[PDB]
Ligand binder design. Structure first.
Ligand SMILES: NC(=O)c1ccc[n+]([C@@H]2O[C@H](COP(=O)([O-])OP(=O)(O)OC[C@H]3O[C@@H](n4cnc5c(N)ncnc54)[C@H](OP(=O)(O)O)[C@@H]3O)[C@@H](O)[C@H]2O)c1
Ligand SMILES: Cc1cc(Br)ccc1NC(=O)CN(C)Cc1cc(=O)oc2c(C)c(O)ccc12
Length: 318
């Protein structure tokens, strides 16, 4: 139930999403990450931005101590936040994430976004006029610093997130490149299926990792409340009744059968355990084509605050 990455490491194809909005007590991340491991998740996706690495790491430590899993059974991902793109800041950011999680290494470290931000303590630096303070960083130099983190064993694998094809190409074409990104973690669901980006990643042996694969948490601060609700889609719901599954399980299985590694966030014990049932059934080829037809080029995360960023990834076709 893993895919082999282009550096030889293995990534479980179903991953547990750990992000919850700040209104959710931090203790919940601890509790639900334990439930996810108990349910059978082995890939756990976190990030400096999520303000939960300490709790996610404590969950992993607890399930190692009670004998459920060994460290080597768990695939843990963290992400370099955009205020840390300048190369001298990369390794200290990873070391801080490892200290918080009380891990010796991450299995995967990602550049969280190509949209570099002003360095400093604030995660969302804002100027006097309320505008996001962007930074300008040659992301190939960020990548070179990521490579030294893998050389040092702090990250078993390195990859990117929210890159478009042109941004990936800049890394792949970098002189003296030592390590390809093993993955590109991007928004991917039936309303935004990234088929062209997927085909490019496949042609380069880069894994596409899907986030918001169940339609996002629809946080009113970042997602239009009027956007359609993915799991209410009539085609997904009819396929769910056909297969005696659920719309969420159809959406997750869709990604698995097109070669995409899929994340699924749930803080609900019953839904966490349901999501591992993605391995219990298959969609037909005709089912897959029906889901392919749902694409609406719908990005659930769509704030104008970032559309002006010079590295905004959605100004390109793919
Ligand atoms: N790299 C990035 O920029 C980026 C961006 C966004 C997300 N991500 C990663 O991907 C993860 C997942 O994406 P996401 O947080 O947007 O959420 P998601 O996986 O799309 O899930 C959306 C909602 O679906 C619900 N859900 C889960 N299982 C369900 C089921 N079986 N039936 C019905 N509803 C179900 C969850 O609610 P309940 O909790 O109530 O079950 C959840 O709030 C994040 O947690 C993060 O780890 C990365
Ligand atoms: C991710 C992204 C990609 C592109 Br391209 C353009 C914009 C965005 N972000 C937003 O629009 C909202 N951002 C600022 C916060 C945010 C809210 C949240 O609920 O979850 C997040 C998760 C799970 C992340 O990993 C990163 C950020 C968030």
């Amino acid at each position: 139930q893993c895919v082999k990455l282009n550096d030889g490491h293995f990534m479980p194809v179903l991953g547990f999403g750990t992000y919850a909005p700040p209104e959710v007590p931090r203790s919940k991340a601890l509790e639900v990450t334990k439930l996810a491991i108990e349910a059978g998740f082995r890939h756990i996706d976190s990030a400096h931005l999520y303000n939960n690495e300490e709790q996610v790491g404590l969950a992993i430590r607890s399930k190692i101590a009670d004998g459920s899993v060994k460290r080597e059974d768990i695939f843990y991902t963290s992400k370099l936040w955009s205020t840390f793109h300048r190369p001298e800041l990369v390794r200290p950011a990873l070391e801080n994430s490892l200290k918080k999680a009380q891990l010796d290494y991450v299995d995967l470290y990602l550049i969280h976004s190509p949209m570099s931000l002003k360095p400093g303590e604030e995660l969302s630096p804002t100027d006097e006029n309320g505008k996001v303070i962007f930074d300008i960083v040659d992301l190939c130099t960020t990548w070179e610093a990521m490579e030294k983190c893998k050389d040092a064993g702090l990250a078993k694998s390195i990859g990117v997130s929210n890159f478009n094809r042109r941004q990936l190409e800049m890394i792949l074409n970098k002189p003296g490149l030592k390590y390809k990104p093993v993955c590109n973690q991007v928004e991917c669901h039936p309303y935004f299926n990234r088929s062209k980006l997927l085909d490019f990643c496949k042609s380069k042996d880069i894994v596409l990792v899907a986030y918001s694969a169940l339609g996002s948490q629809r946080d009113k601060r970042w997602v239009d409340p009027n956007s359609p609700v993915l799991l209410e889609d009539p085609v997904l719901c009819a396929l769910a009744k056909k297969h005696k599954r659920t719309p969420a399980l159809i959406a997750l299985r869709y990604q698995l059968q097109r070669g995409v590694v899929v994340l699924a966030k749930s803080y609900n014990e019953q839904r966490i355990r349901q999501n591992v049932q993605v391995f219990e059934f298959q969609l037909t080829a005709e089912d897959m084509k029906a889901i392919d037809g749902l694409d609406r080029n719908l990005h659930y995360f769509n704030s104008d605050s970032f559309a002006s960023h010079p590295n905004y990834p959605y100004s390109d076709e793919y």
